Write a protein that binds this DNA or RNA. Structure first.
Ligand SMILES: O=C1C[C@H](c2ccccc2)Oc2ccc3ccccc3c21
Lengths: 328, 290
DNA sequence: GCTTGTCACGCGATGCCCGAT
DNA sequence: CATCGGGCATCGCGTGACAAG
C-alpha cells in the first residue's frame, strides 16, 4: 500500500458507484470511460434539474387499461413518429439532450453526443449558420450533420428557443436553449433502384390514351391498369416542360410510323415526376394505324437533366419546373 | 523536431487536458447537487453526487420527459389509428391545445370523421397497406385547420402493452396502425388548367409571384383567387379561349395573393391540341405581375 | 505498424487534523 | 486563545503499459 494509490482507489470506487447509477443499459455502462462517466452523470443531473421546474394522462372519461399502457409509451410513440431525432442545445453549443434515434440517422450513439459540442456533429460550412440560429423564438432552418451510416446528411431543423431553467450557472439567469427536431430532406422525383433494364411497354390509342400496361410499368408509374386509362390521354401525364417535344415526336410518329428516342417526364400516382427515354411505334391493321406501342426505360434525374440540357429543339417552357395533379 | 519528444509532449498535454476535463466535471457536479453549492474536495462532491443520483433514479429520460421535450420543441399531438377503418385507437391530451377538441371527441371516432370530407379520399391513399407524411384539414359552424401529419405504419398490437380480455380493443383485431403526430401550420409563372379553370399544373415560381406554394393552387379553380368584379371577365376569357383554339387571349385581373392582397396580373392563355385528334388537352396560361 | 486515447503509478507540493507547545 | 511541526490525505504533473482503430 501507499497513500497515493489509496486516494486513487477511493476516487475510482466513487467513479464506479457513479457509473452503476447512470440510466443506461449495463452493456453501455461497462464500456464507458471515467471521463464520459462524469460527463453523463452531469448530464443526468442537469436534465433532472431542468425537468423539476419545467415538467409537471388519458381522460378519466376515456380510461381503459390498454389506453393506459399506450399512454405510458406515448413518449416513445412520438419519438418514433418524429422521423428524425430530438436535439436540445445550450447557448454554449453543448448538446443538452439527443434522443436515441440519432443513431438511426447519423450513426452516433446517444451516450457519446450528450454534453458535447454540437459543432462536432455539424458541417463546418454550416456551423456559423447554426450559431446564428442559437442566438421571436420559433426556428426553422437546414444544416448538414455528420453521418457515419455505412459522409454528411442535410437535415431540416424545426424548433424553438426557450429558457433552460435549473442550470445553476455562475447566480446567472437561465440561458436560451434550442429545442429542435431534426428530420431528413425531400426530393420530388422517382428514380428507380434497379434502374438497369427496367424497360416497360405501354399500349395507347391513336391519341396517346393509355389502354394497357405491363407489370414493370405499374411498378414505375404507380397506376393500376384501370387507373391508367381513366385520366384522358397521356398528355395529362406529361410534364409541362416536355409537352411540346412529345407533341412534335407524336407528329413525327404519325407521319412515318416511328417517333424516335425522346426523353421526358411522366407523372406518377404520387404526383411525382419520373424521367423516361421512350420510343413510340405505330401498329397497323388493314394498312391503317390502330394503336401505339411505347417502350420506355426509366432514367435517373442526372441523365434526365443532362438530356434536357442537350435538347434538340428550343421550345417554350423548356426549362420550367412545377407540380401537377391528375383527375378522372 | 525530435519525434519521440514531440510524441511525449503531445501525450502529456492530452493527459493534462483529461485531468482538466475531470476536474471541470467535478465542479459541475458540485454545482448540481443539493448542499454542495450552499467548499468541499473531490471525494465528498463525488459521494454527494452518488447519493443524489441514488435519490433521483432503461432510458436516459422518462417517457414523460421525452414527450415534454418533443412537445416543447415542435408542438403536435399523437394519434394512433387503424389503417383498416381509420378507427382512433389512441389520441394524446395534446389534441386539446392543438385542435381545441377533448380527447373524447376522437376516442370512439375514426380519422375520416375528424377531417374535411374533400380529404377523406386522400386519407385512404395514406392508410392503404413505413413512413408517411401528409397534410389534411381537421375539425375543432364547423371550423377546419390545416394540419401536417408525420408518422409510420406499425404492426398491431404493440409490444409490451397488455391487452386485457374485457378491453374494447380485444375484439378489433387490427393488423396495422398509423402512429403519427399532427401539427398546426415582378416575375411570372406558367400553369395548365382544364377548360373549367382548375389548376392542374403550377410553375414553382408561383411562390415568387402570388406567394402560394404549388400545392395550394393545384385542384382549385383560378376564379376562386380572382376579384369578384373580374371573375366573370376571367370566366369569359376561359370560355372563349376554348372556342378559338391556338389563338392567344390576354386578360388582366386582380389575384388574391398569399397575404390576401390584390395583385394585378396579366394572363396569356392558349389551348394545347392533341396532334392526332385536335382535341384540347388543357389550357396553358402565363400569369405575370403588373 | 502508427495514432490517439485510457488507466495506473511514482512523486513531490500542499491540505487537513491535531496533540503539544 | 492562538502557533507549530507529525503524519496521512488531496491533488496536479509526467511517463509508461496497453489497446482500439
Ligand atoms: O410514350 C409515351 C408515354 C406516355 C405515357 C405512358 C404511360 C402512361 C401515360 C402516358 O404518353 C406519351 C405521349 C406522347 C409521346 C410522344 C412521343 C413518344 C412517347 C410519348 C408518350
Amino acid at each position: 500500500s501507499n497513500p497515493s494509490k489509496r486516494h486513487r482507489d477511493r476516487l475510482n470506487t466513487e467513479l464506479d458507484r457513479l457509473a452503476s447509477l447512470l440510466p443506461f443499459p449495463q452493456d453501455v455502462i461497462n464500456k464507458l470511460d471515467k471521463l464520459s462517466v462524469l460527463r453523463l452523470s452531469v448530464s443526468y443531473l442537469r436534465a433532472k434539474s431542468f425537468f423539476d421546474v419545467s415538467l409537471k394522462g388519458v381522460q378519466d372519461n376515456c380510461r381503459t387499461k390498454f389506453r393506459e399502457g399506450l399512454n405510458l409509451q406515448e413518449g416513445e410513440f412520438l419519438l418514433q413518429a418524429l422521423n428524425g431525432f430530438v436535439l436540445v442545445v445550450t447557448t454554449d453549443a453543448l448538446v443538452f439532450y439527443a434522443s436515441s434515434t440519432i443513431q438511426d440517422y447519423l450513426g452516433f450513439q446517444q451516450s457519446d453526443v450528450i454534453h458535447q459540442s454540437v459543432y462536432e456533429l455539424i458541417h463546418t460550412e454550416d456551423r456559423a449558420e447554426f450559431q446564428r440560429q442559437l442566438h421571436f423564438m420559433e426556428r426553422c432552418f437546414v444544416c448538414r450533420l455528420r453521418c457515419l451510416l455505412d459522409g454528411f446528411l442535410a437535415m431540416n431543423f424545426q424548433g424553438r428557443l426557450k429558457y433552460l431553467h435549473g442550470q445553476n450557472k455562475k447566480i446567472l439567469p437561465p440561458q436560451l436553449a434550442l429545442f429542435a427536431i431534426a428530420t431528413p430532406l425531400q426530393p420530388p422525383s422517382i428514380l428507380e433502384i434497379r434502374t438497369k433494364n427496367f424497360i416497360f411497354r405501354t399500349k395507347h390509342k391513336l391519341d396517346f390514351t393509355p389502354t394497357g400496361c405491363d407489370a414493370k410499368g405499374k411498378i414505375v408509374l404507380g397506376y393500376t391498369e384501370a387507373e391508367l386509362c381513366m385520366r384522358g390521354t397521356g398528355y395529362q401525364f406529361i410534364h409541362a416542360a416536355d409537352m411540346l417535344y412529345c407533341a412534335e415526336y407524336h407528329v413525327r410518329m404519325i407521319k412515318t410510323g416511328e417517333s424516335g428516342m425522346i426523353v421526358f417526364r411522366l407523372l406518377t400516382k404520387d404526383n411525382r415526376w419520373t424521367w423516361v427515354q421512350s420510343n413510340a411505334r405505330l401498329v397497323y391493321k388493314n394498312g391503317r394505324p390502330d394503336y401505339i406501342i411505347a417502350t420506355q426505360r426509366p432514367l435517373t434525374d442526372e441523365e434526365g437533366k443532362e438530356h434536357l440540357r442537350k435538347r434538340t429543339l428550343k421550345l417554350p417552357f423548356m426549362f420550367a419546373t412545377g407540380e401537377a395533379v391528375l383527375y378522372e | 523536431m525530435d519525434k519521440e519528444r514531440l510524441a511525449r509532449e503531445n501525450h502529456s498535454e492530452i493527459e493534462r487536458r483529461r485531468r482538466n476535463k475531470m476536474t471541470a466535471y467535478i465542479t459541475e457536479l458540485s454545482d448540481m447537487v443539493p448542499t454542495c453549492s450552499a467548499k468541499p474536495d473531490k471525494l465528498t462532491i463525488l459521494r454527494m453526487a452518488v447519493s443524489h443520483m441514488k435519490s433521483l433514479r432503461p432510458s436516459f429520460l422518462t417517457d414523460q420527459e421525452l414527450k415534454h421535450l418533443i412537445l416543447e420543441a415542435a408542438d403536435g399531438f399523437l394519434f394512433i389509428v387503424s389503417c383498416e377503418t381509420g378507427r382512433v385507437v389512441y389520441v394524446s391530451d395534446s389534441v386539446t391545445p392543438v385542435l381545441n377538441q377533448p380527447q373524447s371527441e376522437w376516442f370512439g371516432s375514426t380519422l375520416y370523421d375528424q377531417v374535411h370530407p374533400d380529404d377523406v379520399d386522400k386519407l385512404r391513399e395514406q392508410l392503404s397497406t413505413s413512413r408517411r407524411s401528409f397534410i389534411c384539414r381537421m375539425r375543432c359552424e364547423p371550423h377546419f385547420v390545416v394540419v401536417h401529419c408525420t408518422g409510420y405504419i406499425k404492426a398491431w398490437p404493440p409490444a409490451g402493452v397488455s391487452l386485457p380480455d374485457d378491453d374494447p380493443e380485444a375484439g378489433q383485431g387490427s393488423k396495422f396502425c398509423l402512429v403519427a403526430i399532427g401539427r398546426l401550420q415582378p416575375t411570372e409563372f406558367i400553369s395548365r388548367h382544364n377548360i373549367e379553370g382548375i389548376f392542374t399544373f403550377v410553375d414553382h415560381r408561383c411562390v415568387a409571384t402570388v406567394g402560394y406554394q404549388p400545392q395550394e393552387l393545384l385542384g382549385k379553380n383560378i376564379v376562386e383567387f380572382c376579384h369578384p368584379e373580374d371573375q366573370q371577365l376571367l370566366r369569359d376569357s376561359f370560355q372563349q379561349v376554348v372556342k378559338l383554339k391556338g389563338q392567344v387571349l390576354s386578360v388582366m385581373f386582380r389575384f388574391r395573393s398569399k397575404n390576401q392582397e390584390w395583385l394585378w396580373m396579366r394572363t396569356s392563355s392558349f389551348t394545347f391540341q392533341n396532334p392526332y385528334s385536335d382535341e384540347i388537352e388543357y389550357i396553358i396560361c402565363t400569369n405575370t405581375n403588373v
